């Protein structure tokens, strides 16, 4: 099994205990570290903060304590727009320029491999011909991987992709079958399901629909999810199912209305360290004073409500669940977003270090023999 953490470079600037940097991780608890993000300039793999240069040494030295680690660097992500990545898959020389940036940059920082998070071929603004160049993309990365690992004589560089789980995204950008016989390994991002951009409560990573979903409403689950991406021809061993460790937050209209499919009119206050309207880290909820939790019975995961707040979220038993399910449809492994979300310093939950993560690690059956420090949950 694998376990795909991501680290993010700018959980370094939350306040008090929330500041996250590369000492706080801990070199034991994942299979595979992802640094989001990198990003591009001129075609080219480029850093993203003044002091990245330092922290990829950080984080890739925690290979000195566990060597069995492999480390990612992503590209992308949901802020980075869609058109560097269109201008670059535009022409084979772009892509040229593209890919040997990538090797020369990885190698140089000694990152083990590229993680591809655009966010999204053939949607967002990025037009129709994206989709097949986006296959294209891929290819040349994996074959140039290859061919460099045979003139090297170096462990083949990896390539794994972060990939959406909405089947308006997928069709637009993703040639499955294609794409996922060039890939090491395919990150799903089995949340963001619902938020507040609806105008009623939903959650943000429910295991199965509700009894009362219809249409394409009843796809926005994970177990649709992961049945799309495996019958579309993703090996299931390759398949790695995200995990949240966050939730999504509403305001409500009324207090007096609670329910999942409540009238909402818009996000969820700010947490106190995460300050992003919709948005609450674990450590935010898990002990959210005076409030009512409660469990969907139909999605398998948990929401709580406090006066006009809503949020649905992720905790121990929903993570029990889903490994459970995915070892059933015999996945490759859990991924999650993100390391700096978890209690990463049991400074919140009372439920000690990296609560949810230690869960997911357990519960894969990846807890190090020589671990003294663990807690089970
Ligand atoms: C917009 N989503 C939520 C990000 C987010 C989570 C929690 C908080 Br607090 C503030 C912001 C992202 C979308 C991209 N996702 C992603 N997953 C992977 N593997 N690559 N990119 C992570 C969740």
Redesign the pocket.
Request: glycine share 14%; no cysteine.
């Given at each position: 099994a694998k376990l795909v953490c991501?680290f993010t470079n700018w959980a370094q600037y939350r306040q008090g205990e929330a500041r996250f940097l590369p000492k706080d991780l801990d070199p034991s608890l994942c299979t595979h570290l992802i640094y989001?993000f990198a990003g591009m300039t001129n075609h080219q793999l480029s850093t993203t903060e003044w002091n990245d240069e330092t922290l990829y040494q950080e984080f890739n030295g925690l290979k000195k304590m566990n060597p069995k680690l492999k480390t990612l660097l992503?590209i992308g992500?949901?802020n980075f727009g869609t058109q560097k990545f269109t201008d670059m898959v535009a022409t084979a020389n772009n892509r040229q320029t593209f890919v040997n940036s990538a090797i020369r940059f990885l190698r140089k920082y000694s990152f083990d491999g590229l993680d591809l998070?655009w966010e999204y071929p053939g949607s967002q603004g990025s037009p129709a011909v994206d989709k097949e160049r986006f296959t294209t993309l891929v290819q040349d990365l994996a074959n140039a991987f290859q061919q460099e690992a045979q003139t090297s004589g170096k462990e083949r560089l990896l390539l794994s992709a972060?990939v959406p789980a909405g089947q308006t995204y997928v069709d637009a950008g993703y040639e499955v079958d294609k794409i996922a016989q060039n890939l090491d390994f395919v990150?799903l991002?089995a949340?963001?399901f619902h938020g507040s951009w609806e105008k009623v409560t939903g959650h943000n990573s429910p295991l199965y629909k509700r009894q009362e979903e219809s249409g394409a409403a009843a796809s926005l689950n994970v177990d649709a999810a992961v049945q799309q991406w495996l019958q579309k021809g993703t090996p299931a061993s390759k398949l790695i199912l995200?995990m949240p460790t966050?939730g999504r937050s509403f305001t409500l209209a009324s207090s007096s209305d609670t329910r999942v499919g409540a009238p909402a009119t818009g996000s969820g206050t700010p947490?106190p360290f995460?300050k992003?309207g919709g948005?609450?880290?674990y450590y935010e909820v898990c002990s959210w004073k005076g409030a009512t939790k409660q469990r969907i019975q139909d999605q398998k995961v948990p929401y709580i409500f406090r006066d006009n707040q809503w949020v649905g979220f992720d905790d121990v038993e929903s993570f029990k669940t889903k490994v459970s399910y995915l070892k059933q449809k015999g996945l490759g492994g859990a991924?999650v977003?993100a390391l700096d979300?978890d209690d990463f310093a049991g400074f919140s939950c009372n439920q000690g270090r990296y609560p949810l993560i230690q869960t997911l690690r357990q519960e894969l059956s990846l807890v190090p023999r020589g671990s003294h420090h663990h807690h089970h949950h």
């Open positions: 991501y989001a992503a992500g949901w998070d972060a990150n991002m949340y963001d995200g966050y947490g995460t992003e948005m609450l880290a991924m977003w979300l």
